[PDB]
């Protein structure tokens, strides 16, 4: 499939939106062979822990 | 990125997103210079050289 990043993090609606092994900026045109999106709720205390 | 051995002191706020960022702080916007945190503490690797 073909994932829109940019629809995704340029929305107001997250209070943390943090990438780790890239700029987010490369997701745009950077591809992968699959994708996981893991989804849970936590405190607001705790989405530091992540 | 810069050119080879040019110097930039711009302390300007600096815009990662789609959306303008027209004054000094947001959530897609930052102040571009950031502190090494030189601790005593530190392994090396993280040590001033």
Redesign the interface.
């Not at chain 1, 073909?2 to 609606?13: I, M």
């Not at chain 2, 502190?35 to 503490?41: A, D, H, L």
């Given at each position: 499939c073909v994932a829109d990043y940019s629809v995704l993090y340029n929305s107001a609606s997250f209070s943390t939106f943090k990438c780790y092994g890239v700029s987010p900026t490369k997701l745009n045109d950077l591809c992968f062979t699959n994708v996981y999106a893991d989804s849970f709720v936590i405190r607001g205390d705790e989405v530091r822990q992540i | 990125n810069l050119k080879p051995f040019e110097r930039d002191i711009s302390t300007e706020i600096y815009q990662?997103?789609?959306?303008p960022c027209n004054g000094v702080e947001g959530?897609?916007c930052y102040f571009p210079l950031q502190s090494y945190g030189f601790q005593p503490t530190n392994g090396v690797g993280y040590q001033p050289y």
């Amino acid at each position: 499939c073909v994932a829109d990043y940019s629809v995704l993090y340029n929305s107001a609606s997250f209070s943390t939106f943090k990438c780790y092994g890239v700029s987010p900026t490369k997701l745009n045109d950077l591809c992968f062979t699959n994708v996981y999106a893991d989804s849970f709720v936590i405190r607001g205390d705790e989405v530091r822990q992540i | 990125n810069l050119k080879p051995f040019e110097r930039d002191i711009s302390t300007e706020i600096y815009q990662a997103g789609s959306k303008p960022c027209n004054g000094v702080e947001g959530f897609n916007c930052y102040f571009p210079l950031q502190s090494y945190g030189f601790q005593p503490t530190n392994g090396v690797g993280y040590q001033p050289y």
